[PDB]
């Protein structure tokens, strides 16, 4: 069902809005160091 992908694909994107959230934290952490 094509309608079901719309939910799962958006589910995958919730992983990086947090993962990329970690990447900025590391970069700022290195700057403070």
């Amino acid at each position: 069902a094509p309608e079901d992908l719309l939910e799962r694909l958006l589910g995958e994107m919730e992983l990086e809005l947090i993962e990329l959230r970690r990447a900025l934290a590391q970069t700022i952490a290195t700057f403070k160091s």
């Binding site: 959230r21 934290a25 700022i28 952490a29 160091s33």
Partner: protein
């Protein structure tokens, strides 16, 4: 040493989670409060001089 930088990351990660104020907002919350104190006090320094 690793303790100190571990603390650095906790505080920094919180900052992106809750951004600090922009300088633009900083300029007014002092600039407006000056009259928010003076304007009220300008009324007071006129009302109650």
């Amino acid at each position: 040493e690793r303790i100190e930088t571990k603390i650095l990351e906790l505080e920094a990660e919180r900052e992106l989670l809750n951004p600090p104020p922009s300088p633009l907002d900083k300029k007014f919350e002092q600039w407006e409060e000056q009259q928010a104190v003076e304007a009220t006090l300008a009324a007071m320094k006129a009302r109650r001089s």
